[PDB]
Each structure stands twice: as structure tokens, then as C-alpha cells.
């Protein structure tokens, strides 16, 4: 059980997908420079999952009011 590689502003956020980096007080970076290091997960053998509270289609609450899976992010009031 591990969250995926850290990313973004001072490694505060964490990876939810190859191109998704989200943080508690950060929000979500979808395909921005902050998400570049998230590609590295594709190389690690061990399976990871970030977030804690599940929502939507196999997603986890990535940031405030944001639910993300490994390829998308959506607004879910329950996050």
C-alpha cells in the first residue's frame, strides 16, 4: 500500500495518473509541468493509489471538491 510519487509545489502534492498531480491546498495539475514526474510511476513495478476517499468512476478525492482517477478529474461536491 503506497501513494504514488510526490509532485508539484515543494513535492506537496501527489500523483493520481501519468499526467495528474493533485494537492490538498494545491488543487489538480492535469498535464502541466508539475505532473511531469508522474510519468515515472509507469516504470515502478509496485502498484500505487493516491487519495483516500473514493468517489466517481474508480476515483479518489484528489483535492478540495475534486475527484480524480489515473486519467481524469471531475468536480464532486462530496470531496
Amino acid at each position: 500500500l503506497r501513494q504514488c510519487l510526490p509532485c508539484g509545489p515543494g513535492g506537496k502534492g501527489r500523483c493520481f495518473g501519468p499526467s495528474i498531480c493533485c494537492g490538498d491546498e494545491l488543487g489538480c495539475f492535469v498535464g502541466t509541468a508539475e505532473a511531469l514526474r508522474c510519468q515515472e510511476e509507469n516504470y515502478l513495478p509496485s502498484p500505487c493509489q493516491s487519495g483516500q476517499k473514493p468517489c466517481g468512476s474508480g476515483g479518489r478525492c484528489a483535492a478540495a471538491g475534486i475527484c480524480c482517477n489515473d486519467e481524469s478529474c471531475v468536480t464532486e461536491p462530496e470531496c
Partner: peptide, 6 residues
């Protein structure tokens, strides 16, 4: 690797 990608 991301769970559903592994």
C-alpha cells in the same frame, strides 16, 4: 505503476 495500469 498506477493501479489500473499495472
Amino acid at each position: 505503476c498506477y493501479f489500473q495500469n499495472c
